Amino acid sequence: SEDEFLRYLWRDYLYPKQYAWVLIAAYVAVFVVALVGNTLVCLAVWRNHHMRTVTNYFLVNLSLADVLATAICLPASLLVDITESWLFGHALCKVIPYLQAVSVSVAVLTLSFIALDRWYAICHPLLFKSTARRALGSILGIWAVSLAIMVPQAAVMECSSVRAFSVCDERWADDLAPKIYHSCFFIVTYLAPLGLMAMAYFQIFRKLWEVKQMRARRKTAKMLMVVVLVFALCYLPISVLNVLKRVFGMFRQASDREAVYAAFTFSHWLVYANSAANPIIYNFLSGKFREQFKAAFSWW
């Protein structure tokens, strides 16, 4: 009887709390490291004028998209990942998924414009001029586009009541629309930008691997390839799971509901883990950012 008791103690009590601890610790750790890290990126560029480059201005914009997701959307995701219900009412059911989707769009477009800049600077020079004022113009353009293209996402979000509990999920009048929408969503936010980026960085790799500038360029190119690779890894589970669910009608079966919950939770958590990842990447793969981060830890 002793083995059976230890098995139910594990299933009914020890495993669920171990799960809750790991889930909350992981989300809190990501929240702190992403909030501290991304503010320090913004500070590193503001305090050091030599760091005020086109790439670094776009990296500040990537950190602000990261702060938008970490401040507003990360707590909301954590509680849905815990309760599997919506506790912020009808209004925030439209607002919060919209802001998180907008932040992904900004992140993707910011990276695209970085790749583009490096590709024209290194692979095809003298064709297009790239200045800091023009980087701000592109930065504003990225926000206007991300804010507009994510309105359809806000539109389908509905807070449904059916102890009575609300759920925040997409509402679809027909079976065809979610399939077309989530196919476009995935291609535009993930597959086409990263595919184009991987090909651009590979050309930059071929060109880079005037001597002093070529040494500087290789350091930044190595770092940005890591930022893109880490972004592609962090976003792959959520992108695939969304396509499998919305385009291939998977995970509708309730045989192992918790297995699906755990897969979607880890996938939601990884998106936020990305905001904590970037300042850590700039710390190890950038000596200039590291100096500012070391200065911040020594001062505070």
Ligand X SMILES: CCCCCCCCS[C@@H]1O[C@H](CO)[C@@H](O)[C@H](O)[C@H]1O
Ligand Y SMILES: Cc1ncc(OC[C@@]2(c3cccc(F)c3)C[C@H]2C(=O)Nc2ccc(F)cn2)c(C)n1
Annotated binding residues for suvorexant, written as ranges, equal: 242
Smallest distance, Å, CB 183 to ligand PGW? 8
Interface residue with ligand PGW, options 98, 119, 269, 293 (CB under 6 A): 119
Smallest distance, Å, CB 26 to ligand Y? 14
Half-sphere exposure of 271 (CA within 13 A, CB side): 27
210 binds ligand X (CB under 6 A): no
The stretch near ligand PGW (CB under 6 A) out of 133-141, 160-168, 175-183, 232-240 is 175-183
Interface residue with ligand X, options 2, 3, 12, 210 (CB under 6 A): 12
Q: How far apart are the first and last CA of the chain?
A: 56
Which of the choices ligand X, ligand Y, ligand PGW, none does residue 54 contact, using the CB cut-off of 5 to 8 A by kind? none
Give the per-residue contact string, 68-87, with ligand X (x = CB under 6 A; - = no). --------------x-----
Quick one: which of 60, 80, 73, 70 has its CA closest to 100?
73
Which of the choices ligand Y, ligand PGW, ligand X, none does residue 64 contact, using the CB cut-off of 5 to 8 A by kind? none
- Number of CB atoms found within 10 A of residue 233's CB: 13
Q: Which of residues 82-141 bind ligand X (CB under 6 A)?
A: 82
240 binds ligand PGW (CB under 6 A): no
Q: How many residues does the chain have?
A: 300
| Exposure letters 74-88 (e unless 16+ CB within 10 A, then b) | bebbbebbeeeebeb
Q: Which residues bind ligand Y (CB under 6 A)?
A: 73, 76-77, 80-81, 96-97, 100-101, 104, 238-239, 242, 268, 271
Q: Which residues contact 101 (CB under 8 A, 6 or more apart)?
A: 150, 153, 154
- Number of CB atoms found within 10 A of residue 180's CB: 11
Integer Cα distance of 67 and 275 in angstroms: 8
Cα distances (angstroms) measured from residue 78 to each of 72, 138, 267: 11, 33, 12
Tokens 């309730």 correspond to: 254
Nearer to ligand Y, 101 or 276 (CB): 101
Where on the chain is the footprint of ligand PGW (CB under 6 A)?
112, 115-116, 119, 148-149, 151-152, 155-156, 177, 180-181, 184-185, 188-189, 191-193, 195-197, 199-200, 203
Where on the chain is the footprint of ligand X (CB under 6 A)?
11-12, 15-16, 19-20, 23, 82, 155-156, 171-177, 179-180, 183, 247-249, 258
